[model samples]
Target: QPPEEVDVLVVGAGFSGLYALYRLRELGRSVHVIETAGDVGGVWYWNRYPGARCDIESIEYCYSFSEEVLQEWNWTERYASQPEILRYINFVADKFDLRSGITFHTTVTAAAFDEATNTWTVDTNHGDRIRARYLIMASGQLSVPQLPNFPGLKDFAGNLYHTGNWPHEPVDFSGQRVGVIGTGSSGIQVSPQIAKQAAELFVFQRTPHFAVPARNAPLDPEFLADLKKRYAEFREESRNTPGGTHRYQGPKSALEVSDEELVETLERYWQEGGPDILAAYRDILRDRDANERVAEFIRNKIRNTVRDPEVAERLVPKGYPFGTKRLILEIDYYEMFNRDNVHLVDTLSAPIETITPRGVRTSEREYELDSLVLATGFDALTGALFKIDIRGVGNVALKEKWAAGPRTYLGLSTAGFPNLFFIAGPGSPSALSNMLVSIEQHVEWVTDHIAYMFKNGLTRSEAVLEKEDEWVEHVNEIADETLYPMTASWYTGANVPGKPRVFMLYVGGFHRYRQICDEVAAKGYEGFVLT
Candidate 1:
């Protein structure tokens, strides 16, 4: 059953939507959430592929809203797998009774804002219409799954699975020949697990991405208990940092350090493991030479992991700058290359042509496999929102306006879309920061702003056209200074065919972004027209 009317209608029942529902309710506002999935967990609930895990540490990747939830929930691993994270989400949902505010198994097909009433008319796939004073797209950055551009995928006789939209039941790859396409984070993580079950595994890689060992271990109960005592304080420290983790930013320049010193510094971080290596040098992302030096260390590490000389060379990521695309945290991914049944198919040398009824065909040769897994990542960022038909003032479609690329004042609200807000969207440090930290900040700020509007008898909030133009330019200007724009990755919407290549996130770091958001609210929501 869906609500016909409400003060707020939030999309995607993940961390962002759940938090928005809970927090807005705390403000005593009527809020309802519509989720595509049958249950909560959003991304975690959907991506059920083997070896799926969060790169961020378990303790830091959770809700920090309630002291009770923080104290009661226990994470067993250093990094939580999809199942564990989903369970954590379920626990939060149960404890807070968040399901009452949510309509599960629903998709928002269309949403139109009524300028006269300052309300939104939302339609669902189930033929339900809901009206709300405000619309919050808490839909995720990486929710939409992408299929590779190659043809004949439908003709392939073998089983096909996508990591992002994996089958619910356990898929048995035992004794089957499995071929995995794409080598981004999902491909790297899923391949090793498939190799263990499948009799033969062929990893089809176009451009090899850099991967660092996660070096995960079990959490000690005593350490967990001690940390629980000061858990809120710990999360606060994370919120104040750049990456939304306790990653200490290294002060040294990679060019300034000698080869010996750089290697020693990088090796220490490598051994410690995790994505904190991105903070090894101040100029790593800014300077090409700095990134290359650090990149060489990881390349050599990958080379050493694989036994065959040719295979080692193939596994090494060349040309692109490290940390430009999201860095992958791998466990036994590189080491899996040493196994007899595992094969790395270099698609760059012999580009993938198409899929046949039997298997995949490349420029070089065709690979026959019983099962094919498309670990090809997502459309990312705005992909989910683009699926919905959203129109604003003057009946302008949101998809048409953002066809070139999304334009937002703070990545929160677009110019024409009155009373609409995006949570953890591209304009903010969403993907660049720990998502939980980013989600919390956006949810709180947006909900507080909504409360302010109600108290002042204000309605119809929209980003000013000039302010949105300036903000989009600022986002691109900052991105152009880094290696992120130079590379083709999902960060710039390169993964999607015909999608704009504009860099989408704020690179100014989380702490600074938070301050900017705080100032905007303090200044009576500057750059916005709230009437």
Candidate 2:
């Protein structure tokens, strides 16, 4: 069959894809978006599990593209929950009339670049073929769910759920004994919610993560009104900052301060709650000695929170540096451990032998569960892209080419893939910063580049091989200078076995990364070959 032709084809209907479709339409391009989801709101739509909320503040974690959107949307809480965020996404879709250009419930199966036509032919699972001059993968960084690779998983008699792929309808875990695995952000967030419903909840922990209190509260209408008046200026300031948030970056290093001062400063942040504690010390993520001081303070806080010394000690993070892994924000997560019905199974001490018919079997004993929740997290940045059969120049497979690690120039276009771009993918300050900030920057940059090419009657744009290599090296060198590489975090693709353990994100500050991207574009898209 002859493929439907469009100027650009976008994959994924999340924030990135929606924005790309809107912007491309404004630029007079025929763009079509294909989404695997039933609707918009990529992460928010899929992650409807209990207690799913944005770690970033509600005011900052929104679309900055439209002043209308900024003024219209009203956020009820300091940190928005998954349902609220999903509604906000739907509002934007309706406001912008974005659903018309989108094809929902269809996944892109394969995409191959045609050398002769300077275009890509994409195949979808629904048997629709598409030919487009440019392909934009707005597939989210944490889209793909990873299941525990243990034996006898299918034989488990009880219900199984993944936090990433939660049911749309409310799931009642009333009067049930649940076993939740993994201690990442999802596990941390979901466990507290389940504890309130389930008769008994067991949290299996392999590695303990540092989490600060969320202290989430309702937003003051007056404050929100006043802030909305200066929303543009506020957004501009955010765009210029390192982390893309309004929080002040600490000027002093952890090592420079005395113990009393350090404790006082950290205590203030901890009391207030949220991720501001990570920014309390400038060198927390930089030097090992500096990181240790902050880590010790948090460990002491954990010890003081839980009633049982053994349980608290087990929960205290020991092996890794503070703020190295994603700093989690918690609401009554530590206190949940104090519940009589709650149990913490230390998997590191007693590793799981296998999954029996009833539940998981550990080296110590088998604990039966009425339901099992796999908070096992995703394969991260590369996983979603790997699922699609993508071929570039000379029919070279993207998965095979990136076997060692993801290679891209400025985290936009890869070396062999012409007229193809990744939004908030690896090799950029993607997962490292506020995702909304990163998503907007990537979508705008890619759309503008496409508009530039169309204006000049150009078809192909690919990263220079040498420049991509240099960028990969630069990403590694920056990661190595800090303590981020010392631990087995998802940032290094360590969560999934057999995946290469290389740092995928650019640790350089978001503002600096934005400047580099802008400068490259100013120099006629430097490090790329335009034809």
Candidate 3:
């Protein structure tokens, strides 16, 4: 069989891949995109659970590059549901005529670097091969789903659905019993919506997370018009902000304001709804005392809404500092437990023993269920990319190198992996921030670097060994300075058992990291080996 060729081969046809392809096409570069799903929308295509949605307000969460696209589309609410976002993506695809260039329903199983030609040979699951000088991995951080490791899961007769990898067809639970495991972001977002549909909803909680009310609402036409008027400034501000969601920049630090004044400010922020409230105090993430204040403030909200003392206490997270793990946004998540048809099981105290033929079995008791939803989250940071058979120089496996832990230079490219670029992969500010902003930054950086190499007559480029070591250490050091390491969050790859317990992403502020990236580019792309 003959091998197909392109200037660049982009993996995954999600927002990142779509934008990357669009940008490259504008630059007059040949490109082909491969998608595992039958269509565009990546994670949105797969995660069609009962109620999955974007926590970021609908209007701001979308792509800001195209003014025409922004004006043409309409967002209904503060948060966007899966179906609506999927439709928007479909519209974008149709508008740009991007479908013909993408090979749908094809999975890229392996990728090998060819040192002789300084290109990559990519193999898909269906026995097709393609070659490209640059490989752009737009496979998202949360693209891969993690099913529960419970024994006898397959043997059980009852139906099972993972929220992360939900089927396209609608799931019926109108009169059926259901058990939902996990209370992470997905769990928090979908549980309340699911409860209204199911006859009985059993919520299995391991670690109670700090969740604030999303306060989602309909978009006022005038408000949206006002935002578009300042689109340029808003886009620029987003890039300069820490987590890429700085719509409201208030006091820099909590210590800068009085206790009464801070309370009033947080109260107003809580009503407006967004992640910027956490940034009210510059020291909240680093200082334990300051972090506790925000934790207490949220706990009080939970207690006030939950009604039941026992259930309310169970919902408030303890031990770890607040905002350490990415904060969960929800609308009446704790309040849903107060419903007549809802139940809560603290798995941490009793623990899940295994899955029974009928349902899940805990140490204390067994609960029969008609269906089960495992929103257990993902391996995160490195699971998706590492699953594929990716080999670099000397045919060294990427998974084997990450068997202990993931190590990458600035989380853009790994050492010895020539021309293999990761867009928003591990050891970067990915899962913790507004993904669209973080993703666009990575795609631009990788593509620009490739263009720069081509212009300089360089055959290959890879992360320098010394720079890779320094970057990994620097990421860990930044994480250590904060309370991120204190909790066992997915950012540390702790959700997946037997995975190494190391902080995977750079915790340094995004603006500072962007400056570092800019400096690298300005200084002849220093800390990289070019051949």
Model 2 lDDT, residue 13, Cα: 94
lDDT of 2 by residue, 1-531 (tens): 223999999999999999999999999999999999989999999999999999999999999999999998999998999999999999999999999999999999999999999999999999999999999999999999999889999999999999999999998999898999988899999999999999999999998999999999999999999999999999989888878887889999999999999999989999888898887878899999999999999899999999999999999997889988899998999999999999999999999999888999999999999999999999899999999999999989999999998999988989889999999989999978888999999999999999999999899999999999999999999889988899888898888999998988998879999999999999999999899
Q: How many residue pairs clash in each candidate?
A: 0, 0, 0
**What is every candidate's alpha-carbon RMSD to the true fold?**
0.8, 1.2, 1.8
**All candidates' TM-scores?**
0.99, 0.99, 0.96
**lDDT per model vs. reference:** 0.93, 0.93, 0.84
Candidate 3 local lDDT, 302-401, one digit each (tens): 7888878988888878878898778878887877888999998888887999988888899999989988889999878687787789999999999998
Q: Tens digits of per-residue lDDT for model 1 on 1-531?
A: 889999999999988999999999999999999999999999999999999999999998998999999888889999999999999999999988999999999899999999889899999999999999999999999999999999999999999999999999989999998999989999988998899899999999999999999999999999999999889899999999989999989999999999999988989999999999899889999999999999989999988888899999999988799999899999999899999999999998989999988889999898898999999999899899999999999999999999999899989999989999999998899989999999999999999999999999998788999999999999999988989999989989999999999889999999999999999999999998889
Candidate 3, 128: how far from true, in Å? 0.4
| Residue range with the least summed lDDT across 10 consecutive positions in model 2 | 1-10
The residue pairs found clashing in candidate 3 are none
